Amino acid sequence: KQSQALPFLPYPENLSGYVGDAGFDPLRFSDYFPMDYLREAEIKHGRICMLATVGWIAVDMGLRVYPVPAGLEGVTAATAHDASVAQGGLGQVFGWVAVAEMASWIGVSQMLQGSGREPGYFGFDPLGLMKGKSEAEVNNMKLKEIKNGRLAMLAFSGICTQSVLFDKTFPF
């Protein structure tokens, strides 16, 4: 009845499944927006930032692709966006993200009209890793994804701001 993260606010009451729940949501976006959309957005914000904070850390700590293509030679992670769109690069990344996001949009749109799809469910599990696991263990691994995703969202925002404001690379 009371929120766990904020034990003076009531429980938001729309978070009752949803493995990463702290009862946290004070502004009650779960009251106004569908929780299937909100968890799909949290998961997608999470696994993008998990790749992004590892890709910003790797590029700032040396580690270019070898051999380096033309136009990406003296370039850090804070200047690799515009240098890659001039080289080509992100133009092909944008093309294949677009055909993934247009196809996943039909997944999100059919999830909000039924279809029983879990938010943040694609078929992508090629290395097994869920070969008949129990639902208490499936929901535990889903909690590890949301917790690590929630950390990398705050981490990338720290890394990207500090690398541009104080003008340094990631071991500041």
């Binding site: 003076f8 606010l9 004070p26 502004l27």
Partner: protein, 164 residues
């Protein structure tokens, strides 16, 4: 009926002091839960403010931007830290707290599921509600006195210029 719904009808001698001459709690009877959540908020702010004016006049935090050479007494701490950053840092986090915590707190108070003034600090809070009610009027009386104390300190330190 604010004196039966809420606690704090006392004076400095502990006698019963029903103090609403303008009758704002009867003219604005739906607002009296907001009136107590904001009286405590004004009270708890002024109690930290009166300490933070006196403690600044002897101790600074050890940085050079906060040093005694930069800000002379305590009254220049507001204006000589606006563009510096520390006033913008507390404006962010108090304003983030008031947007994310306090604004959902005052709508849960209007719906009736939390008490006004309660932000979850129940560690040293006694049970046996009249004992808690005695702690709230001690918070209220020290709060209401500090609201004049920070009015007195910040006004007298400008027209007279003296510290403490």
């Amino acid at each position: 009926s604010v004196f039966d719904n809420y606690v704090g009808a006392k004076d400095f001698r502990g006698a019963e002091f029903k103090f609403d001459p303008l009758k704002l709690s009867e003219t604005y009877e739906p607002f009296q839960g907001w009136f107590r959540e904001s009286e405590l908020r004004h009270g708890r702010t002024a109690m930290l403010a009166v300490v933070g004016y006196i403690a600044t006049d002897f101790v600074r935090i050890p940085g050079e931007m906060y040093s005694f050479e930069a800000i002379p007494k305590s009254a220049d701490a507001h204006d000589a830290l606006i563009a510096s950053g520390p006033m913008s840092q507390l404006l962010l986090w108090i304003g983030l707290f008031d947007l994310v915590v306090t604004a959902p707190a005052v709508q849960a108070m209007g719906k009736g599921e939390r008490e006004p003034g309660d932000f979850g600090l129940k560690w040293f809070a006694p049970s046996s509600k009249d004992a808690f009610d005695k702690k709230r009027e001690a918070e209220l009386l020290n709060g209401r006195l500090a609201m004049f104390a920070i009015g007195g300190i910040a006004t007298q330190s400008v027209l007279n210029g003296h510290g403490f």
